[PDB]
């Protein structure tokens, strides 16, 4: 269990090696304004996504970061968000853990 794929279609998304401890933890449990709870895992890098729209700062769970919706580039499943416009690091991915499948390289 080293690679993360899209749970719906099996698109290659990220690696356990690429987990990023933002504020001391890679896992952040967050709620959106619609009251949906997400278990978000922070990654330095991801692939196989499609980033939709222009960045927005509204309701950002990570101070100083603007977000873009990250879909699976293959099946269009909402996998999380790309974050940018911040510092150390400038950019990262917040992916919804339960929408990924972990398995061998
Ligand atoms: O960091 C983030 C990413 C985006 C996320 N968010 N989900 C929404 C659903 C409906 C309307 C606005 C919304 N904002 C959020 O709350 N925070
Ligand atoms: Zn997919």
Numbering used by the authors: 19 to 123
What does the paper say about this structure?
We hypothesised that replacing the phthalimide core with benzotriazole, thereby removing both carbonyl groups, would possibly eliminate the possibility of hydrogen bonding with the conserved asparagine, but also rid the molecule of the “dissatisfied” carbonyl group. As the net result, the affinity to CRBN may be retained, assuming that the introduced triazole nitrogen is less unfavoured than the carbonyl group due to its decreased polarity with only a single free electron pair. We designed a thalidomide analogue in which the phthalimide moiety was replaced with benzotriazole, using an innovative synthesis strategy. To our delight, when evaluated for affinity to the thalidomide-binding domain of human CRBN in comparison to thalidomide (1, Ki 8.5 ± 0.8 µM), using the recently reported thermophoresis-based assay, the benzotriazolo analogue 2 displayed an improvement in affinity with a Ki value of 6.8 ± 1.6 µM. To gain insight into the binding mode of 2, we employed our previously established crystal soaking system based on the bacterial CRBN homologue Magnetospirillum gryphiswaldense Cereblon Isoform 4 (MsCI4). The obtained crystal structure revealed that 2 binds in the same overall orientation as thalidomide, but lacks any specific hydrogen-bonding interactions with the target other than those mediated by the glutarimide moiety. None of the benzotriazole nitrogen is involved in hydrogen bonds, not even to water, suggesting that the retained affinity could indeed be due to their lower polarity as compared to the ‘unsatisfied’ carbonyl groups in thalidomide. Despite the absence of the carbonyl group involved in hydrogen bonding with CRBN, it retained affinity, likely due to the relief from the other, ‘dissatisfied’ carbonyl group. These assumptions are corroborated by the crystal structure of the complex between 2 and CRBN.
The traditional immunomodulatory drugs (IMiDs) such as thalidomide and its analogues (all based on the phthalimide glutarimide core) bind to Cereblon, the substrate receptor of the CRL4ACRBN E3 ligase. The binding mode of thalidomide includes a hydrogen bond between one of the phthalimide carbonyl groups and a conserved asparagine residue of the protein, which contributes to the affinity between the two molecules. However, the other phthalimide carbonyl is not involved in any specific interactions, not even with water molecules, and thus represents an unsatisfied polar group that potentially lowers the binding energy.
